[PDB]
Symmetry: D2
Subunit: 340 residues, 4 copies
């Protein structure tokens, strides 16, 4: 039941063509620290992971980045803005898995090219001053570009998975674990516990050979509230999450996803969620360290990549709505930071 | 990352412990037999039974030699295959199984663990006992999948795309558990996904990464393992079956007598089997198999002090095992007659 | 007694960045056949392997190529001109081993870069319509660029070596085996015999992993007369070589090296040797299928790479002398071909 | 991959090293014998290195039995001779033929290299375990990773002494190395090879895990020349004295080894004794520049095309065990006197 096995270039090949620049290296290292500070309550800025549900077009992604960069800089004292640069998508059943798996968007599975494109995009983003985030779904691909990533997500469908927790335990960036598809938070709390410890498992080296990897633990993990059978973004759900986190002795600072099961897949509700968060930040909101927003140049979605700057996976808010949502959150958090 | 250590590739182990003709024949055969059960071509009942986890190959061999007599005795009613689980998903942390740490002392001697697991599996198949395991890691299966007749994807990974990818390329039938809180849809979805062709990054038998292109696994099914509440009874089975037919996949399913269906009390496994027995007597058309956590000695222990006694989930003992198997054999003999 | 082990990119990396073009592929394939034809007496054109003793500067090599190309074309009915593009040099004791082993020429041993440069140069040469030749000295480097090579040499110092005969047995290009440093011809005749057979040995794949290679034999091997304690380029030496070749049942068509031990340390002598060959081609010269000439933009040699287009290994004839030598051989062989 | 028929699965050295890890006793013998030989190479000890045994190993059981006999003599003569067994797994052919036990261990054209490499490691481990150190010709670039840890002394053959990749290889081996003069008698190429091998090199090699890598060697300071004849023999005093002057001149060790076989015996195994007799006499008169000898020896004398008779070479002809006992006593006696004069 295996059709074929094909030639794969090892990470060192891509690392040779596209070595990390000093300026990229500095941004990554820096943003990781900054985020770690948010995770552990040492800085009260709000982390904002924002951008497309998935990258299908580097040029659009670069243009998006350039716009977002101005706002990253403008709001830098209230918000820590990092771009969503997602290359791997977990499907409910089957479908396009992302740019790495099939970069020509036609069923050709040109993975060598996909991995090259993903590294290239990430390098250009970091070079221009925009840090990047992604969902780490595969066990092997991260060796190809993890060095360019400032923050990582483990998805709702894999938070419970031991191999994903293992993976997170060895990543050098902070990591967010989503609650489960039906709303189970415990699995994410458990995942932080697990990922913070040392693990031994089989992995693949930068030279494309299998090996035993021994990780040191990732101390910068946190939970992401992304809704379930019902939304879990409000104050009450946040307060209950926080108590459970303190109970298991892990960080009670969390991220709230404005999209997915919290917006019920209606991109026009992301603003409502952000409005609720804004209010929580104004009243108290002490347990919130970040938010997640799926955002693009052009709002909505499409099945085929016909329109530029428009998602082919989950529907996104457009650029206008994005400017508004960011100003809303910046304003709200400026007040939270002023209180102490 | 603290360290990176010297991993032998599968071909090393395959060279020392090549699959024998007799093992190869048993595997191939038991895979077909199970496929038949999955697709309703045979009415025997698949019974995946044995320890929660293997921590001692000698005990596992003795268990096997007892189970073998019953496999034979009940071969017309039951298809008995031994649980030979080498990888254990922990809720947080703990011992991850014999592969990850075979000396049990925190030494993580994986090369040795993989060797021991292959060796045990080869001896089991050689003696006429087929084997089953949970495929948890993406890379370890290359080392011994050829000796496995049936595979499980655990409750914790059924929703995971990489595990569905993996299942898509396994040559054995595969059971997907419903989720830890009882969600069945994820398992139905997983069958759908695993039955299709996938492209992903994997590791060859020579220990090098490569692009793998799978052909799909047509012999997947669902496993009812309880959630917030048990899901083994006739009603839950009927509801499961309707959902499965609705998604156009096999409406033949497996019921786990342990874990969340026994509420983590090994003494309830018998109750669940009693309910299944009754369903098999009345009708039970949608049941193709059961799962039972069983050992020489009942219960559990935190240290491997007593021989033949689980150090992970508590198991029923051998006495209780003979009883459960006779109970299911008797019940299914009637279902097969009535057809 | 091993200091270190360093990261080596596998051939597939270089093959991905610099894949062989259709035009290059066609030229190589074609030139291999054309040379095979000479080796086995199906065409009477004269193979001329000509160019620098070693490549130390790709720009000079490209300019040399552009000049040589015009002559390749001009003389294409009489001569088959292929450029010497030698990247690996055997030293009598120690010294610079070539551009691959140390491309910056400062003792840095940047082999990943050297291999890249060598591939790049070879691709550009073939793309411009100039086929290439080299000495295959290492067992592993050929995987990186053999696909761009139209004719290969096994050196005087390795003709007797079984691993080099093995290597030749698997090369897809014709191969010339030099007589030994003291003039022993038998070792080259033996080598043809060996290289023409099937071998099993340990090699390295294009992915940089060791494997058992099973070769089919190279049926296009021939001998190269390169002098010894005494020169062996004249008619008598050629006739005696030819008799020995027929006796061992292998091709009695051979190449004569105008340089090295045949010119005895004065590069000017190369012209004398070519004069003698010319005369042989006028009288009869039936057993001669090619010649080898060490040639550059500028004549002579130098210890440091100070002057452009001037060898830093064996001394070469200059471009003027080169035009002369080629016209001389073209004129002579035109007559040999006319006799028929 | 045009005139390549196939590519087959090769187990990496680490596989074999896992099944057959070097024992403490083996490790100690190897380390110790390497030092002892180094001492001979550099004139710190006057014992005579004797590399002796079959031209090629085609049968491990015969090799073990040979070893057990040779061991008694290794012990008996330990104050005069340093005896190390010839355990040659790779044979360079003049054209084609059987290339040795590694390349084709079933001796039938099956090229079961994985098995050959296993057998070679196993034999070497058993030899060192029983107290018999081992020597081989390093011919391939890749096979040595599989068993070099079990080798106390290495040869680079007449046909490869001039080869740069073999000099590179020697530069990274942990054992002493002998370079043979060329097939027609050229000694310079061996002197050059010592020079080269003693320096640091960078080249492409294969790791113990079966991946290519850049290897940086530190140089092998324990290389020496081996006189093995050419168009004419080169074992006598005069040839030795002329070799020695050339060695001093290039600033490398003037202590050398003389091969009693191959071109020195004109491929007549009955002449090996004559050569040893000449050496013996040189050791009695002076023989200051001689640090060792090489002898092609087996249980049974002669050779055969097919492996019919036990203990009988299928490559160069060897002297038999009787002749071996005599040759060793002859050299022991002779060298006991040389060591007395000091
Ligand atoms: Mn999304
Ligand atoms: Mn269990
Ligand atoms: Mn030259
Ligand atoms: Mn021999």
């Amino acid at each position: 039941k295996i059709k074929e096995v094909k030639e794969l270039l090892p990470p060192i090949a891509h690392l040779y063509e596209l070595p990390i620049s000093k300026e990229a290296s500095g941004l990554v290292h820096r943003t990781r620290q900054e985020i770690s500070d948010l995770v552990h309550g040492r800085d009260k800025r709000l982390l904002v992971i924002i951008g497309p549900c998935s990258i299908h077009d580097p040029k659009a992604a670069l243009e998006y980045a350039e716009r977002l960069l101005k706002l990253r800089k403008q709001y830098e004292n209230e918000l820590l803005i990092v771009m969503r640069v997602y290359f791997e998508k977990p499907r409910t059943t089957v479908g396009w898995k992302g740019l790495i798996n099939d970069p020509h968007l036609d069923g050709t599975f040109d993975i060598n090219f996909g991995l090259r494109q993903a590294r290239s995009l990430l390098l250009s983003l970091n070079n221009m001053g925009m840090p990047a985030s992604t969902e780490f779904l595969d066990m092997i691909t991260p060796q190809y570009y993890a060095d360019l990533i400032s923050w990582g997500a483990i998805g709702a469908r894999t938070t419970e998975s031991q191999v994903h927790r293992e993976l997170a335990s060895g990543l050098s960036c902070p990591v967010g674990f989503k609650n489960g598809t039906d709303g189970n938070l415990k699995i994410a709390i458990d995942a932080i516990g697990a990922a913070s410890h040392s693990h031994h498992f089989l992995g693949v080296t930068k030279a494309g050979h299998s090996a035993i990897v021994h990780t040191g633990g990732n101390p910068d993990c946190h939970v992401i509230l992304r809704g379930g059978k019902e939304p879990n973004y409000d104050a009450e759900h946040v307060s209950e999450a926080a108590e459970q986190l303190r109970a298991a002795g892990v960080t009670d600072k969390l991220m709230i996803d404005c999209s997915h099961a919290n917006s019920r897949k209606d991109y026009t509700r992301q603003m409502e969620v952000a409005q609720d968060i804004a209010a929580q930040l104004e009243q108290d909101g002490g347990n919130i360290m970040g938010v997640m927003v799926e955002s693009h140049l052009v709002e909505g979605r499409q099945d085929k990549p016909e329109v530029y700057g428009k998602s082919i996976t989950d529907a996104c808010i457009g650029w206008g709505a994005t400017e508004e949502l960011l100003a809303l959150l910046a304003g709200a958090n400026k007040k939270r930071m002023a209180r102490a």
